[PDB]
């Protein structure tokens, strides 16, 4: 997949991102300035100046002419250098230069030594530092996404894949003849839990990405699914329907001990953790149509928390616990909505068709989700203020079940 932006950039903060200086003949091994500009645009917060229009192309902070940029309403410029090392690695350095009220002052700078295969990563690190310095929000440019691609035909039509957040460096985690569901990231970013029907029924598993190792979590009769790792690394929440309806369970990852959290005759599924690793939001149909409820895993009756439209489900709680996104339905349409968890206020974010499975970026500023376009599923992005909208189109196959990775604690 790759990001295609549909709306929201024009209003963004103007910024200058200059092509990086290259200490060699011909083209640089990677366009680091291009990566930084794309990342900042993808955040929905910045409007990098077009290359046709750069007033100068300085290769260092000292070469910046602040007046050329203030004349364009640009208060910051990113410059940088890529240089080769004798061991075959590269240095990627950037400087962020104030071109507003402190003209010529360097606000931030760094240099990274990386192998050729990690040059995009170096670009994303620069983007993360620039983004955080200017906005005060931690950058998510070094994150990855997981998603399921379903092709037409073949012995293994279902693939769970992982890529960088912008689509690059895609790889296949697992191929299957039968549906795959609901990938979930461990907080250390090393594992995905997911559901597979390849055995003839559902099984919930955890796969280690680096080596493909698979741990079986649950394959009780009926459904085993809807995983979510606790932020503290200790637990996996999930839903089982062996009792006759979906209910919530938690596994202590160290011991493998499973404890039942809900025992309703209603269906209770789609758990998502609060930052404390003790409370879950989840979908229950206890009240009739699905709504989102919250419960502490240690005790107490679930409490209904949603009243928007006619029905609400499939929530994702933000990393700070201040809000959630969810799928809100009525009458006959379903969209991604954001609910403030202190006030109960709601804002509908999307207007696409059959919106589902929203997942927040770890800085809480962006939502990846899936919708229907023509006859098949696709991936969408919407900012949490609703202003920025983009897609992640694929060349082949339907794309669904996206999940945004945590922050960090042929490849290029």
């Amino acid at each position: 997949v790759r990001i295609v932006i549909d709306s929201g950039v024009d209003s963004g903060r103007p910024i200058g991102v200059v092509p990086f200086q290259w200490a060699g003949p011909g083209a640089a091994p990677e366009d680091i300035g291009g990566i930084v500009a794309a990342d900042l645009r993808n955040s929905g917060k910045f409007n990098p100046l077009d290359r046709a229009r750069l007033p100068q192309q300085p290769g260092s902070a000292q070469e910046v002419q602040p007046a050329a940029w203030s004349a364009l309403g640009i208060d910051a410029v990113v410059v940088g250098q890529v240089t080769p090392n004798p061991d075959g690695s590269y240095n990627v350095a950037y400087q962020l230069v104030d071109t507003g009220g402190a003209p010529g002052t360097v606000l931030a700078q760094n240099s990274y030594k990386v192998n050729k295969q990690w040059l995009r990563y170096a670009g994303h690190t620069a983007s993360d530092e620039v983004f955080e310095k200017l906005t005060g929000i931690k950058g998510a440019f070094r994150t990855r996404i997981a998603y399921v691609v379903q092709t037409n035909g073949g012995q293994f039509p279902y693939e769970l894949r992982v890529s960088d957040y912008d689509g690059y460096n895609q790889f296949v985690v697992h191929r299957s003849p039968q549906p795959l569901m609901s990938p979930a990231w461990s907080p250390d970013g090393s594992k995905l839990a997911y559901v597979t029907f390849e055995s003839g029924r559902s099984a919930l598993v955890i796969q280690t990405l680096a080596n493909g190792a698979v741990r079986q979590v649950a394959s009780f009769p009926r459904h085993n699914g809807a995983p979510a790792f606790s932020p503290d690394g200790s637990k996996l929440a999930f839903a089982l329907s062996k009792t006759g309806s979906l209910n919530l369970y938690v596994m202590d990852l160290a011991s493998g001990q499973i404890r039942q959290v809900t025992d309703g005759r209603s269906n209770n599924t789609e758990p998502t953790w609060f930052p404390d690793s003790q409370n879950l939001a989840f979908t229950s149909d206890q009240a009739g149509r699905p709504q989102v409820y919250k419960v502490n895993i240690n005790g107490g009756a679930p409490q209904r928390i949603t009243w928007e439209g006619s029905q609400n489900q499939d929530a994702d709680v933000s990393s700070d616990g201040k809000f959630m996104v969810m799928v809100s339905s009525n009458g006959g349409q379903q969209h991604i909505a954001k609910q403030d968890l202190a006030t109960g206020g709601v804002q509908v974010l999307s207007s696409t068709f059959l919106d589902e499975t929203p997942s927040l970026a770890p800085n809480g500023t962006m939502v990846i989700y899936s919708s229907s376009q023509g006859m098949g599923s696709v991936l969408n992005l919407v900012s949490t203020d609703g202003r920025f909208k983009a897609r992640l189109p694929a060349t082949d196959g339907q794309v669904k079940f996206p999940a945004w990775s945590p922050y960090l604690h042929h490849h290029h």
Binding site: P179, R222, A226, S241, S245, L246, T269, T283, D285, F353
Partner: protein
Amino acid sequence: QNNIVYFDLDKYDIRSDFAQMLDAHANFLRSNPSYKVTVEGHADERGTPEYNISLGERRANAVKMYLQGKGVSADQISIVSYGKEKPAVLGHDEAAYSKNRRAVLVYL
């Protein structure tokens, strides 16, 4: 067509028109105690994947309870809900949705 029960939106009850159909399966299962039926339950696309598993389950469980009421042993019936993961037909109108809200009896 002699092995599929169809359902209305958010409904999971066995309609009279499928009684005869299911009676034939019950007869077979009673007469052949070694055979097991798998009831595969499905939902239409409206909703979300993990929740919609429950709509398929309610449909598949209704078939199971009907068969058990006709003397079939509980150990000759399994249910597997695919929620909205395995549509019979593609489309975004009731023509498609009605075709997709189903429980399918298969001898695997």
